């Protein structure tokens, strides 16, 4: 099974023209939590944006051109992508915008956090029908000393 895991600002802003103003260690533990041990794809921009390579997961980086970093796999189509994963019961897809694009059609779950931020969005997280989707874990959190924003974590199942 394949997973979209992503962080999506007011109109579904996931991405902008530099880092995201806000500070979530509590969405990125979100984060950990429901990738680690599995397999993850990105592209090349949100590998950037990372730095290095997530620990304990194996990293798939989906991109045309050739690959600037052993300590991760680089493949050139969906397809690659998802055959370096190997036989695992679910891939994480991790970004960005047009990775999720790809790979929303063949996706069965969405681990979204929703986050109560208005900014000008550079990228979007795909307009899903929130119709064709069942939420089957919802937990609200306000801001607090450690999270500068109010945010929503949502696990949604393709009805
Ligand atoms: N829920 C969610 N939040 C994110 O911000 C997010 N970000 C991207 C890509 N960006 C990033 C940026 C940093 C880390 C990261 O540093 N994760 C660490 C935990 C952070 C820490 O320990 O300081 C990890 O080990 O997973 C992950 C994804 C894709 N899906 C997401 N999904
Ligand atoms: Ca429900
Ligand atoms: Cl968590
Ligand atoms: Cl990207
Ligand atoms: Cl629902």
């Known amino acids: 099974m394949i997973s979209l895991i992503a962080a999506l600002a007011v109109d579904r802003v996931i991405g902008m023209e530099n880092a995201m ?4 260690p509590a969405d990125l533990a979100w984060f950990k939590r429901n990738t680690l041990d599995k397999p ?5 921009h949100t590998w950037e944006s990372i730095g290095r390579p997530l620990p304990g997961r194996k990293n798939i980086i989906l991109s045309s051109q050739p690959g600037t970093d052993d300590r991760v796999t680089w493949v050139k189509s969906v397809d690659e992508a998802i055959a370096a994963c190997g036989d695992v019961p679910e891939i994480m897809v991790i970004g960005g ?4 694009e790809q790979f929303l059609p063949k996706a ?3 681990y979204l956090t ?10 979007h997280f795909p307009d899903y029908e929130p119709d064709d ?3 089957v874990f919802s937990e609200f959190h306000d801001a607090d000393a450690q999270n500068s924003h109010s945010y929503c974590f949502e696990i949604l199942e393709r009805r």
């Open 108 to 110: 069965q779950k969405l």
């Open 97 to 100: 915008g047009r990775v999720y």
């Open 21 to 24: 103003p806000w500070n979530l």
């Open 40 to 44: 993850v794809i990105m592209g090349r």
């Open 133 to 135: 989707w069942e939420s």
């Open 114 to 123: 929703h986050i109560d931020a208005e900014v000008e969005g550079d990228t």
